[PDB]
Amino acid sequence: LSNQISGLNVATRNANDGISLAQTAEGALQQSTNILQRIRDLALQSAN
Amino acid sequence: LSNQISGLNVATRNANDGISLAQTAEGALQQSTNILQRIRDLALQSAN
């Protein structure tokens, strides 16, 4: 049981690192979405 | 929805630009038809 609980603690910690990495990726993806919106705006302006 | 909103705003801006262009062309057409009016006056007084 001690081995199991230690494994679960280290696994929850690794999962915390994973969710932080995923949130960083999600923020970068949000920034790419904003860039794509700006691109569509400037492209429809490029119709001119 | 955000992309659609942005596209509609830039489309309305292009629409105002086109309305202004057509209004300038309309003013030029009014001037030309006034000149043609004066031309007919000069031609009929040229009956002499």
Q: How far, in Å, CA of A28 to CA of A36, rounded?
A: 12
What is the number of CB-based contacts under 8 A between chain A and chain B? 20
Distance from the B9 Cα atom to the nearest Cα atom in chain A, whole angstroms: 9
Q: How large is the angle between the packed helices A2-45 and B2-45, nearest 10 degrees?
A: 0
Interface contact flag, A40 B2, Cβ < 8 Å: no
Largest CA distance in chain A: 70
**Technique that determined the structure:** cryo-EM
Q: Which residues of B touch A41 (CB under 8 A)?
A: 6-7, 10
CA dihedral B41, B45, B46, B48 (to 10 degrees): 170
